[PDB]
Amino acid sequence: PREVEHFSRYSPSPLSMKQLLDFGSENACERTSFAFLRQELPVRLANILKEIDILPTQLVNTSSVQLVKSWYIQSLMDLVEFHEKSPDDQKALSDFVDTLIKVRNRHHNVVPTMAQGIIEYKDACTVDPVTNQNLQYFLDRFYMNRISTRMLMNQHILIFSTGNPSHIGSIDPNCDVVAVVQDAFECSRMLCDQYYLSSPELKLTQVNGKFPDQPIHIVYVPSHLHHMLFELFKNAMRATVEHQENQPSLTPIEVIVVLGKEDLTIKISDRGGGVPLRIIDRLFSYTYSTGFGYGLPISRLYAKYFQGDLNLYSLSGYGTDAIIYLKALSSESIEKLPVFNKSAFKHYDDWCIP
């Protein structure tokens, strides 16, 4: 409808982790957050809605994609309804919390519903290299967009409706990185043991280049950090178990946590045989697995969402290294947000290739 095209004319406004903190830690003005989000969420919903229409028709027409599209247009309409209310009407502040909760429940199944559309589409139809590349591009952007809107909405929900008191919404201002590592390792070990009757141990070490004795803390969303580590541990454990199938014991998964001036980096090392350089990129493809191959690409989105990153490099025949990079300063942890614009629409032989 009209509002999809109207609000798609705005570009999304990215926030730093620091802004989110500074706002909601001490002042936490419910009026301001409400005014901000009733504008911002529609803009981000409308932007990704426009981008959906660019997709191949037999993909857009799947009941899956039509579901996502309709939930989004529905959420966008719900929210826009609050532009007529005043920030001072509290039946409005209160209903907005409720509307956000409804919206978060409505999008709960967005990821797998969209994934089903893709799977349906790829199974059924033949896909040019170009189109399969556009799908990757689209999905990184669609899922990033959902990560960002979930982030914003939960901050408002948790702060003004409640969660952990040590945290400001979903943000932990003193995130104990090492402890998130151990916790994510356990979730993985549980599943590994409950499936293979065995699992590698953790060998973790840490270096605080900043204060060489200090425990390692940064501002971060531990939930996001947990998701990345968990997925990387699942992979490293499965690879270790399957590669050492003829073994008495499993080699340890080795992790090092390092804090430098501007980076926090976590390197996870396994001796699970690796994969050939030829295959690496396919790992980060949404439909590549050997339980669905969303681990790597989604984890990489969580890493990138605040200007971090996630890389794999492997020694085929021996093992694999996964590195997570996170920004160390909260001021530089700024959302990486897709905007639908000339440059993006455009995006949808140089050397001799073998």
Entry field: residues in the chain: 354
Site string for ligand ADP, 25-44 (x = CB under 6 A): --------------------
Q: How far is CA 267 from CA 237, 254, 256, 315, in A?
A: 15, 8, 5, 15
Cβ–Cβ under 8 Å, residues 328 and 262: yes
Q: Is the distance from CB of 41 to CB of 145 less than 8 angstroms? A: no
320 lies in the binding site for ligand ADP (CB under 6 A): yes
Residues assigned a catalytic role: 227, 231, 234-235
> Does 251 carry a binding-site annotation?
no
d(CA 160, CA 87): 14
- As given in the structure block, the two tokens for residue 152 are 């914003």
- Choose the binding region for its own copies from 68-76, 80-88, 158-166, 271-279 (rule: CB under 8 A): 271-279
Do 178 and 226 form a contact (C-beta atoms < 8 A)? no
Is 276 a binding residue for its own copies by CB under 8 A? The answer is yes
85 binds Mg ion (CB under 5 A): no
Judged by CB under 8 A, the chain residues 280 through 339 that form the site for its own copies are 307, 309, 311, 313-318, 321, 323, 325, 332, 334-339
- Structure tokens, 214: 């200090």
Distance of CA 351 to the CA centre of its chain: 34
CA-CA distances (angstroms) from residue 300 to 125, 128, 147, 209, 291?
27, 25, 12, 25, 17
Opening angle at CA 293, ends 231 and 15, nearest 5: 60
Q: How far apart are CA 354 and CA 259, in angstroms?
A: 42
CB of 293 to ligand ADP, least distance (A): 3
DSSP-derived secondary structure letter, 244: T
Which DSSP helix (H) or strand (E) runs through 184? helix 177-196
Residue 24 marked as a ligand binder: no
User: For strand 309-315 and strand 319-327, is the pairing parallel, antiparallel, or unpaired?
Assistant: antiparallel
Residue 28 phi/psi, 5-degree rounding, is 40, 75
Check binding of 293 to ligand ADP (CB under 6 A): yes
Residue among 296, 310, 326, 339 that touches ligand ADP (CB under 6 A): 296
Contacts (CB under 6 A) with ligand ADP, residues 216-245: 231, 234-236, 239
Instruction: By CB under 5 A, name the one of 102, 104, 217, 234 that touches Mg ion.
Output: 234
Q: Which residue, 137 or 288, has its beta carbon nearer to ligand ADP?
A: 288
> Considering CB under 6 A, how many residues would be counted as binding ligand ADP?
20
When asked if residue 79 is in the footprint of ligand ADP (CB under 6 A), the reply is no
Pairwise CA distance, residues 151 & 146, whole Å: 8
User: Is 291 annotated for ligand binding?
Assistant: yes
What CA–CA distance (Å, rounded) separates 245 from 203? Answer: 21
Per-residue mark of binding to ligand ADP, 264-283 (x: CB under 6 A): ------x-x-xx-------x
SS3 of 207, please?
strand
C-alpha count within 13 angstroms, C-beta hemisphere, residue 337: 26
Name which of ligand ADP, Mg ion, its own copies, none residue 139 binds, using a CB cut-off of 5 to 8 Å depending on partner kind: none
278 lines the binding site for its own copies (CB under 8 A): yes
Task: Report the alpha-carbon distance of residue 339 to residue 341 in Å, rounded.
Answer: 6
Q: Which is nearer to its own copies, 167 or 243 (CB)?
A: 243
Give the contact letters, 196-225, x = binds to its own copies (CB under 8 A), - = no: -----------xxxx---------------
Q: Is 346 annotated as a binding residue?
A: no
Q: Is 291 in the site for ligand ADP (CB under 6 A)?
A: yes
If the CB atoms of residues 62 and 314 are measured against its own copies, the closer one turns out to be 314
Q: Is 72 assigned a ligand-binding role in the annotation?
A: no
Q: Would you tell me which residues interact with ligand ADP (CB under 6 A)?
A: 231, 234-236, 239, 270, 272, 274-275, 283, 288-293, 295-296, 320, 322
Q: Would you tell me which residues interact with its own copies (CB under 8 A)?
A: 11-12, 14, 207-210, 256, 258-263, 265, 267, 273-274, 276-278, 307, 309, 311, 313-318, 321, 323, 325, 332, 334-339, 341-344, 347, 349-352, 354
In the annotated binding site for ATP, the residues are 231-238, 270, 289-296
